[model samples]
Target: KSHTTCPTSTEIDSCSNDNNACGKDVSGSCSSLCNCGNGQTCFTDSNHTITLVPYYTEDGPFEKKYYTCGDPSELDECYDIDKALEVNESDDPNSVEVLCHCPSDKIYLWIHRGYYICITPPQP
Candidate 1:
């Protein structure tokens, strides 16, 4: 079955417990294994590497938070920290968090800045 949001445990296990449906493109669309929206595709750079696109960041007194379109490992594709927009102050800086919206079957492979966080929409 195809999914419009992050696949549920039932959905992932439906494909042999390996989440095979996610990576496969079926009929010009992401397969049931995908965790993102139907029209969203994995970010790939010119070098054919899966990349993240950074859009927002918050600097705290002790910690930082970042937002991206893909996984955080795509550091090369991330926005320049020097030029990144400062969205918040460092008053409650507790830990670094990198928020991502990755493609199907993708997991955090890198440590990122501190803690990599990805939030996907709930499954129907």
Candidate 2:
């Protein structure tokens, strides 16, 4: 459960352990936190709404995953190779880098097993 964003490159480089790459995204809740609705896990910041849908992953049948969805926001569309690199370097900090941007659903799951940061592009 985190409410902080990924650390800067300098901070990540200075991290003592690899796990501290980007810190973590704020743990999401539906009831009163995210403000989406009851019995739902969602994150709303600015005009964008990120919903996390729980499901089983293909790699890990027993493992739980949260697919992502948004409100037609361009920046929040999907993850790309290069952007994923920046995310991995600062957030996951592991060997496996995030690949593509998930569609309206399907949140990208981390292979290294760490916190998932919901990256909302800086407000313009």
Candidate 3:
């Protein structure tokens, strides 16, 4: 979901809107959360390999969340925060991306559970 490295303060500061603070790490230092302009959404640190929301009600392709990075990666649901931010900062599609991966036997249920699998984002 994320590399071991973190974005510098320079990267954090560039995000638009709020540019708010992030949760503290062991050092008591904190990473910053991302905010985006129109047509984009900020996906804070998470490493889920699935859907827009676990509940999937009232959902859209994007959610205007304050995606935090520099805080590092963790998992509960989709939002490969680092990769999303990296793709976003590149300014190409002006969109975010998350990875999805599932294993061999698991692929049998893949079509039905696409939003619930992905042990990793890469293909099996």
Candidate 2's C-alpha runs over 4 A off are 1-30, 34-72, 80-102, 113-124
Q: Write the per-residue lDDT of candidate 2 for residues 1-124, one digit (tens) a residue.
A: 5663221232122223221111223363221211121222223322233322222345532322222223333434444322332233323233222233434344433334333333332222
lDDT of 1: 0.27
Q: What is the TM-score of each candidate against the true structure?
A: 0.18, 0.25, 0.18
TM-score of 3: 0.18
Q: Which order, best to worst by lDDT? A: 2, 3, 1
**Using TM-score as the measure, what is the rank order of every candidate, best first?**
2, 1, 3
Consecutive 10-residue window with the lowest summed lDDT within model 1:
13-22
Give all candidates' CA lDDT scores. Answer: 0.27, 0.29, 0.28
